[PDB]
Amino acid sequence: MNLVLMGLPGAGKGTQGERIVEDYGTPHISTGDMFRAAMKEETPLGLEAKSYIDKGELVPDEVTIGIVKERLGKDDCERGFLLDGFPRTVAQAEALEEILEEYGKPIDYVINIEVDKDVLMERLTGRRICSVCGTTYHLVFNPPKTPGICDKDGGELYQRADDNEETVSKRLEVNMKQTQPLLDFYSEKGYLANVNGQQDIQDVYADVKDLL
Ligand SMILES: Nc1ncnc2c1ncn2[C@@H]1O[C@H](COP(=O)(O)OP(=O)(O)OP(=O)(O)OP(=O)(O)OP(=O)(O)OC[C@H]2O[C@@H](n3cnc4c(N)ncnc43)[C@H](O)[C@@H]2O)[C@@H](O)[C@H]1O
Ligand SMILES: [Ca+2]
Ligand SMILES: [Ca+2]
Ligand SMILES: [Mg+2]
Ligand SMILES: [Zn+2]
C-alpha cells in the first residue's frame, strides 16, 4: 500500500500511522520526524529547516520535496509506504504525483483524519513524545503506563519545541489555509477517504483499518 496521511496539526497522524505500520509494515515516512532528526544531528539541512519549524511555518517546498524524493527512492519503500504530513501544499502534491510515476508506485489512498480545529490546541500542549522512538502520549488522552517514560523502551518523554500555544496557533493558521486546496486536489484524483478523528484512538483506528 502506498498511503498518505493528512490532517491538521495534532489530528492524530502519528498515532494512527503507528498502528498502520504495526499491522502492515509499510515504512512510516514523516517529514516532521525527518526534519527533527536533521535538527537533532545539526546537519546543514536541519539548521535551514529549524528557522521555519520553530515558527510553525512550512519549510520551503523545494527542499521538502527533495528529501521525500530521496527517501522514497530508498530500498525499504518497495513493499509500500505510509507518508505522513507530506504533501501539505498542492505544489507538494503535484510533485508527489510526478515522483510516484517516476518510482512506479501510484497512491492507493489519501486518508484525511478530520478533527475540529478547536480541540487541537489541547491535544498539542498536552502531548508528550518519546525521546527514543518518537511515539506520542498525552497526559490525559493517552497516558504512559509509567509517568515520564515510554511504554516501549523507557525513553524520557518530553514536550516538542513547537507544541507551545504561540507556535501551535501559527501552525494551525498556516495549515488550515492549505487544507481545502489539498482535499480538492485529492478528491478530484479519487484517492481521498475521510475518517472521523474525534473518537477514541482504537475507534479511529478501526475506521482506518476498514478503508485499507
Ligand atoms: N510537507 C511539509 N512541508 C513543509 N513543512 C513541513 C512538512 N512536514 C513537516 N513540516 C515542518 O515540520 C513541522 C512539524 O511537522 P509535523 O511533525 O508533521 O507536525 P503536524 O503535521 O503538526 O502533526 P503533529 O506531528 O504535531 O500531529 P499528529 O497529527 O501526528 O498527531 P499525534 O498522533 O502526535 O497526536 C497529537 C496528540 O493527540 C493525541 N491523540 C491522538 N489521537 C487522539 C484521539 N483520537 N483522541 C485524543 N487524543 C489523541 C496524541 O496522544 C498526541 O498527544 C511543520 O510545522 C513544518 O514546520
Ligand atoms: Ca552532526
Ligand atoms: Ca470548531
Ligand atoms: Mg506526527
Ligand atoms: Zn519510545
Numbering used by the authors: 1 to 212
Task: Give the article text.
Adenylate kinase (AK) is a phosphotransferase enzyme catalyzing interconversion between ATP/AMP and two ADPs and is inhibited by P1,P5-di(adenosine 5′)-pentaphosphate (Ap5A), which mimics two adenylate substrates. Structural studies have revealed three characteristic AK domains, namely, the CORE, AMPbind, and LID domains. In the present study, a structural comparison of AKp and AKm revealed suboptimal hydrophobic packing in the CORE domain of the psychrophilic homologue, where a polar side chain makes contact with hydrophobic neighboring residues. We also determined the crystal structures of two AK mutants, which showed the largest thermal stability transition compared to wild-type (WT) AKs.
One such position was residue 26, located in the loop connecting α1 and β2. This residue belongs to the central CORE domain (residues 1–30, 60–126, and 164–217), which are known to be important for the overall structural stability of AKs. Mesophilic AKm contains Ile26 at this position, and its side chain is in close proximity (<5 Å) to other hydrophobic CORE residues, including Met1, Leu3, Val21, Tyr24, and Leu82. Notably, a thermally stable AK homologue from a thermophilic bacterium Geobacillus stearothermophilus also has an Ile residue at this position,26 supporting that Ile26 is important for optimal hydrophobic CORE packing and thermal stabilization of AKm. Mutation of Ile26 in the mesophilic AKm to Thr (as found in psychrophilic AKp) resulted in a 7.0 °C reduction in Tm. The I26T mutation in AKm significantly reduced catalytic activities at high temperatures (55 and 65 °C), whereas the activities at low temperatures (5 °C to 45 °C) were similar between the WT and mutant enzymes. In contrast, in the crystal structure of the AKm I26T mutant, the polar side chain of the mutated Thr26 residue cannot have these hydrophobic contacts with other non-polar residues in the CORE domain. Consistently, the I26T substitution reduced the apolar buried surface area in AKm.
